[PDB]
Amino acid sequence: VHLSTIQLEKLSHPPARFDNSFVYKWQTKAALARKVSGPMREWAAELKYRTGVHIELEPTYPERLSENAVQWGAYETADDVDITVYLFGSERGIFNCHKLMEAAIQQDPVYVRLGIFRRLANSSEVEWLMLRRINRELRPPDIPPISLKLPGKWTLLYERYKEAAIRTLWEETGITVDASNVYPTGHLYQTVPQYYWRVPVRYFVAEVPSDIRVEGPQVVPLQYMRNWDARLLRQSPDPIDRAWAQLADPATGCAWMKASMIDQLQKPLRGDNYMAIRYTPPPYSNLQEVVGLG
RNA sequence: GGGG
């Protein structure tokens, strides 16, 4: 796959807070600094590949991040959070990186999810392809160790929503879907000031043939659950594990599950209507009836 | 900086 103005204030001398590179500073809000670092620090890593400059963020007034009620007091939303961006690199680096950021501020970095479903014989219900990605141990305090997810990752710099959903679908399942068969189904943005770095998420759906070859993760494959012990996990007290043993393929790390099961499994850590809120097809797709979410 |  094919992998208004920002006022930078040059620091004549670097503060010992970080100790012949140049150092530039940008004072802005989390509404904008969210996009220069991106969904998973990935847009920052890409600004690093393209220009070589390193980026670091820090709240300007972290003390306001501890108050509950509202220059002083609690922040109302995560977008009013004051953020200080520091750029480290050559002068041509900060220069080249400066416009890339000025094009990134106008984009909308998001996480993307492609709900892949298949029809069943003797059926009006459908099954969805499910993954279990094991999260890094350097993760915020509200993110569990293992995430039961549908295929999808995040957009790259300059990448549109649906192409990212198509790209990252193949990266985690080896399945190739055509753009004419992907339909947008919704978007969520639920963040709180303390999680000022959270980006929204765009949702899509598509139907694959019932006999489709599910190869599994094609990128970072050891970052997903596979080759588990069938009996060991069958006695786990977590209902998701007990569901993973019964349904998932240990060779690929993928499982086909009904929407009545997904919402039940996701109910503790998400709530009700998990599938219907995210993956309800639009009427023009002739898919609402076959999906069964209405 | 993981939309479970």
Numbering used by the authors: 59 to 61, 76 to 91, 95 to 145, 157 to 380
Question: Would you copy out the relevant sentences from the publication that reported this structure?
Answer:
The 5′ ends are processed by a pyrophosphohydrolase complex termed the PPsome, which is composed of the so-called mitochondrial edited mRNA stability factors 1–3 (MERS1–MERS3). MERS1 was shown to be the factor responsible for catalyzing the 5′ processing event while MERS2 and MERS3 activates its catalysis. Interestingly, the MERS1 Nudix motif (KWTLLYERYKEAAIRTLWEETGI) lacks one of the key metal ion coordinating acidic residues, which in MERS1 is a threonine instead of an acidic residue. The MERS1 structure reveals that it is comprised of two α−β domains.
To address this question and obtain insight into RNA binding by MERS1, we next obtained crystals of MERS1 in complex with an RNA binding site, 5′-GAGAGGGGGGUU-3′, and solved the structure to 2.6 Å resolution. The MERS1–RNA structure contains two MERS1 subunits in the ASU. In the structure, density is evident for four RNA nucleotides bound to each MERS1 subunit. Strikingly, the third nucleotide constructed in the structure, which is the best resolved of the RNA, overlaps the position of the guanine nucleotide in our MERS1–GDP structure. The well-resolved nature of this third guanosine suggests it as the linchpin in RNA binding and supports the notion that the GTP binding site in the MERS1–GTP structure does not represent the location of the bound 5′ nucleotide of its RNA substrate. Of the four bound RNA nucleotides in the MERS1–RNA complex, three have contacts that would provide selectivity for guanine bases and hence they were constructed as guanosines. Comparison of the MERS1–RNA and MERS1–GTP structures revealed that RNA binding induces conformational changes in the RNA binding pocket; Superimposition of the MERS1–GTP and MERS1–RNA structures results in an rmsd of 1.3 Å for corresponding Cα atoms with the significant conformational changes between them found in the RNA binding pocket. Specifically, L2, comprised of residues 222–230, which covers the RNA binding pocket and is unique to MERS1, shifts by ∼3–4 Å to accommodate the RNA. The largest conformational change however occurs within residues 111–128 whereby the helix composed of residues 116–125 shifts as a unit away from the RNA pocket. MERS1 stabilizes its RNA in a single-stranded conformation.
